[PDB]
Amino acid sequence: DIVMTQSPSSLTVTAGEKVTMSCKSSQSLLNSGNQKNYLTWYQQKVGQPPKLLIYWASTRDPGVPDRFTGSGFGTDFTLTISSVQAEDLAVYYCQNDYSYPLTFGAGTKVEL
Amino acid sequence: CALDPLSETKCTLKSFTVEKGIYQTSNFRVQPTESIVRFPNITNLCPFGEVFNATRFASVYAWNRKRISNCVADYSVLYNSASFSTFKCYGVSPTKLNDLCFTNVYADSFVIRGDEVRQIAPGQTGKIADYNYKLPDDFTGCVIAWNSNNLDSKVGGNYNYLYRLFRKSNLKPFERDISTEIYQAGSTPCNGVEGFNCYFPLQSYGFQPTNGVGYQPYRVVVLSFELLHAPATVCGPKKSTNLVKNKCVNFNFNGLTGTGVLTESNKKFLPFQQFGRDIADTTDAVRDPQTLEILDITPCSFGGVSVITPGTNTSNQVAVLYQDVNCTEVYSTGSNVFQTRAGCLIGAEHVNNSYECDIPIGAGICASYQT
Amino acid sequence: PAYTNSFTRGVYYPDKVFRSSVLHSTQDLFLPFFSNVTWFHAIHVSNGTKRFDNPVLPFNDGVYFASTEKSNIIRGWIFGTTLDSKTQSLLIVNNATNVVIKVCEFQFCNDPFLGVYYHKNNKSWMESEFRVYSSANNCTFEYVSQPFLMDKNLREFVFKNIDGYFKIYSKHTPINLVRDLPQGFSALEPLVDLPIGINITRFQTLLALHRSYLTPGDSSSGWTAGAAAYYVGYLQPRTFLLKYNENGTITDAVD
Amino acid sequence: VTKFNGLTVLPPLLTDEMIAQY
Amino acid sequence: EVQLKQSVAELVRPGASVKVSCTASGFNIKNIYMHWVKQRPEQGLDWIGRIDPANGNSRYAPKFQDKATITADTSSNTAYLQLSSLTSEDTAIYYCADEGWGFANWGQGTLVTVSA
Ligand SMILES: *[C@@H]1O[C@H](CO)[C@@H](O)[C@H](O)[C@H]1NC(C)=O
Ligand SMILES: *[C@@H]1O[C@H](CO)[C@@H](O)[C@H](O)[C@H]1NC(C)=O
Ligand SMILES: *[C@@H]1O[C@H](CO)[C@@H](O)[C@H](O)[C@H]1NC(C)=O
Ligand SMILES: *[C@@H]1O[C@H](CO)[C@@H](O)[C@H](O)[C@H]1NC(C)=O
Ligand SMILES: *[C@@H]1O[C@H](CO)[C@@H](O)[C@H](O)[C@H]1NC(C)=O
Ligand SMILES: *[C@@H]1O[C@H](CO)[C@@H](O)[C@H](O)[C@H]1NC(C)=O
Ligand SMILES: *[C@@H]1O[C@H](CO)[C@@H](O)[C@H](O)[C@H]1NC(C)=O
Ligand SMILES: *[C@@H]1O[C@H](CO)[C@@H](O)[C@H](O)[C@H]1NC(C)=O
C-alpha cells in the first residue's frame, strides 16, 4: 500500500510548449541489482485503455516516442514533454511495481 | 470418548465398566512434517552469457542465428544484470521465463544505434528493420537492448558495424539476407559499377563518444521461443530443497512423490541405477540426485493404540501401548515411558522382578496393577 | 549370409531400478535365447579387392548388434526410416578424441564412411575427413559423450526405440573365440537413453576406411578390412526372469 | 526354517527363548 | 500482434455473481499470469489483484480482499473473474493485463453496470 499523488493533476499549455508535471512516489522504490526504478508511466485517452508510455522510469516505448525521458532516484519522477500534440492530449498515470501491493496515481489532464 | 484413554476404551467397548485387559481403541499415525524436493544439478547451462559477452556482435543485416537446447537456461543472471535498458517481451511474461520452458530457443545478436532500437520490434516498421531484421507480429519472445557506447564507439569513428538500407522488398521475419550486390535503384543497370542511379545498399555507421542519447551504439539481442511435439531438452532451473534425514517428510526425487522418513543406507547402487525396490515392488531406497549416496526410505511409523487398564472396579488408571512405534516421536508422553519390542508403554513403570502374566502385552512383557 | 546361436547374450537392464537378491520377472523386448543372429561379413579382402556388404537391415522392434573386431573397423551406425533427405535419420559416428551423435535429414550416399589418413612424421592415424552425409538439414540433435568404441574383445550393443527415446545398451568383454559368441552371460548396462522422436524402420552399420582404402585405385591393397564382422539379432516381445545379486547386477536370466 | 500399507506383524506373546524354556 | 479480447459487458443484478472471461491471441495463458484491473469512472484507476494459470494462489488488493475472486483456466486461452456483492460503486470499466514491466496489453473495455 503506497499512496500515490500526481501534481498538479490539471494544467493548460499552448501547442508545442513544454509541460512540467511530476508525481511524488513514497517508499523510495528501488531494486537490488538493477538500478532502474519500478515505476511505469501510462498514457490513457478517452475511449481506449491506457498504454505504457514509459516503463522502468526510463524506456521509450515504440510509437509516438517524443522524449518522455524521466529522471528520478525513486522518491520523485518526472514526465516532462517538450511539445504536446493531439496524441499527447490525454491523462498520464504513474504506477509503482516494486511493491507487490500496487496503487495507480490520480492522473494529470493536459490539453492543447 | 475424547476426554481420556479410559473413556475411549469405554466407548469402544460400549460398556461403562471395562474388564482388566488390553483394548485397542484408536490407531496412531505420524503425519509428514514437511515436503522435500530435490532435482539433479544443472550440469548443462545454456551459453547465453557468452553470447551476451561476445566482443564483436553480428551485423544487423547478418544477424547470427543459434539454436540452443539440451541445457538449462538461467534467466536470473539476466534480471540481476543492470546493463540492460530495454527488456521488452512479446507474447511471454519475463517473470515466467524460468518457470515455463520451450522445446527450442533461437537467439539473434546485432548492434544498432540508440534511436533505431525501437524500430526493431514486432508489428513495427523502420528504415532498418525492413531490410536488416524483421520480427513477426504473432512471435513470442523477448527483446534485450543495452547501451554499448564505450565499446562500440571511438573518437575517430567506428565504421566496423554495417547496416542495410536499400532492397527491393522487405526481409521476411526470421530471414537474413547477406547479399552485398549493388542495388539497382535507378532504371539504368548497375552492372557492378557505382553510378548516379546506383548506390551501395550497405552502409557503415559513424560512431563518436559524444553521440548522446539516441545516437550512441546499442547492443540489442532478440531471443525466440517456440514449441514442438518432440520431447523438450531445454528447461529452466528447478527448485531444490535442503536434505533432511530421520524426519517423516514428503519426498519428490524426480517423480517418486512418496511419503516416508529418509535414513542413510549401506546399500550400493549401480552407477546408472537410481530407484530401489523390494520383493513387493515398493520403493525402498532412492539415490540423492545432488550427491551420490543411498537414502533408505522406510515409511512413516504407524500402529494401533491399545489402552492397558485393570478392571474399573479395581481402579481407574490406564497405560497406553503405541504398537511398533519408537516413541522418540509421538496419556501424554513423558510419564513413565518404557520401551519394549511390541511398542512403548506410557504410564507404566518397568520393574525388574518377574511375576506371572496378568495383562499380555507382547514379546514376553506383561502389565499388572501392583504396588 | 551366416547364422550363429545367441545362447544367453543380449539381455540388458530393463530399467534403472536397483534390486538385490531378487528374481524379477519382466515382460520386455528381449533377444530370445538360443536364436540365430545373422553373421554378416562386411568386407572380404583378397589384391585388396573390396566386397562391400552393408545392407539396409530392418530395425523391427530392436537390434542386438555385436562385433569382435579389434582393429576398430566397425566405427558407426546409421538409423533412418528411408535413409534420405525426405525423412529424419539418426546418425552415429565414432572418432578418436570424442563421438558425435547427429540426428538430421541426411541424404545418404551409396557407401557412407569415415576417412582416416596417416602422418609419417607424427606416426598417428588421425581422421582425414568425415564423408557420410551429402546433406544436413533440420539438425535438431548434437549429443556428444565419451567414446565407447575404443579398445580380441567382444563388443555388444542393443538399440531400441520407444515413445521417442532411443536407448543404447553396451558391454565390453574379452573373448578368445573369433567366429562365435561366448557361451556365457553378461548383462548389458544402459549407455545413453538419448531423446529422439523420429521413427526408425531400417538399420545400417558404418565401417572405418583408411586413406589406403580411399586411393584412386579400385582395389584397396594398402588397407584390409577382412577382420570386419558384425553380428545382428532382433529383439522380440518376451517374458524373462532376471536374477539380481546383492550388488544389483544381473547374474543370469531365464527365457 | 527361513510393508506399511496397513500391514503390521504383531510380535508373538511367547518369545522363542520363552518357548524354549517351556 | 497480441490482443486481449475480454467478454462483452453484460447486465448484472445486486447480490449475484458475474464471470468475466478474457481471451488472448498469438500465445497461450500458460506463460502469462494476467492481472485484472478496474477503472472507476471520474476516479483514480485501481488494481484488483493477480492470478496464475498453474498454482493460482491469487493475491488481491486489501480493499478487494475476500470480495473479488479470480480464477485462471489452464486451457481454452481464457481466464475468469468473479465478483459478488456488487453495489453502485462497483459500476466501473475493467481491463486485462500482460504482467510486463507495466500492464502491456489491456482488454478492449467491459463496462459492468448493476441496476434493476
Ligand atoms: C556477460 O553478460 C551477462 C549478461 O547476462 C552479465 O551479467 C555478465 O556480467 C557479463 N560478463 C562480464 C564478464 O561482464
Ligand atoms: C551439485 O551442485 C552442488 C552445488 O554447486 C555441489 O556442491 C555438488 O558437489 C554437486 N554435485 C556433484 C555430484 O558434483
Ligand atoms: C473386580 O472384579 C474382578 C472380577 O470381577 C475381581 O477379581 C476383583 O477382585 C474385583 N476388585 C475388587 C477391588 O473388588
Ligand atoms: C529408537 O530411536 C533411538 C534414537 O536414537 C535409538 O537409539 C533406539 O535404538 C530406537 N529404538 C528402537 C526400538 O528402534
Ligand atoms: C533393573 O536392572 C537394571 C540393570 O541391571 C538397572 O539399570 C535398573 O536400575 C534396575 N531397575 C530396578 C527398578 O531395579
Ligand atoms: C538357425 O538357422 C539354422 C540354419 O542356418 C537352422 O537349422 C536352425 O533351426 C535355426 N534356429 C532357430 C532357433 O531358428
Ligand atoms: C572427433 O569428433 C568430435 C565430435 O564432435 C569432434 O569435435 C572432433 O573435432 C573430432 N576430431 C577429429 C580429429 O576428427
Ligand atoms: C559384487 O559383490 C561381491 C560380493 O557378492 C563383492 O565382493 C564385490 O565388491 C561387488 N562388486 C563388484 C564390482 O564385484
Coordinates of N, CA, C and O and ligand atoms in Angstrom, one line a residue, chain C residues 245-249, ligand 8:
Chain C
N245 N 22.0 -60.1 -8.1 CA 22.8 -60.4 -7.0 C 22.7 -59.2 -6.0 O 22.0 -58.2 -6.2
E246 N 23.5 -59.3 -4.9 CA 23.3 -58.3 -3.9 C 24.0 -56.9 -4.3 O 23.6 -55.9 -3.7
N247 N 24.8 -56.9 -5.3 CA 25.3 -55.7 -5.9 C 24.2 -55.0 -6.7 O 24.2 -53.8 -6.9
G248 N 23.2 -55.8 -7.2 CA 22.2 -55.3 -8.1 C 22.4 -55.6 -9.6 O 21.7 -55.1 -10.4
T249 N 23.5 -56.4 -9.9 CA 23.7 -56.7 -11.3 C 23.0 -58.0 -11.6 O 22.6 -58.8 -10.8
Ligands
LIG8 C1 29.9 -57.5 -6.0 O1 29.6 -58.4 -4.9 C2 30.7 -59.0 -4.4 C3 30.2 -60.0 -3.3 O2 28.9 -60.5 -3.7 C4 31.7 -58.0 -3.8 O3 32.9 -58.7 -3.3 C5 32.1 -57.0 -4.9 O4 32.9 -56.0 -4.4 C6 30.8 -56.4 -5.5 N1 31.2 -55.5 -6.6 C7 31.8 -55.9 -7.8 C8 32.1 -54.8 -8.7 O5 32.1 -57.0 -8.0

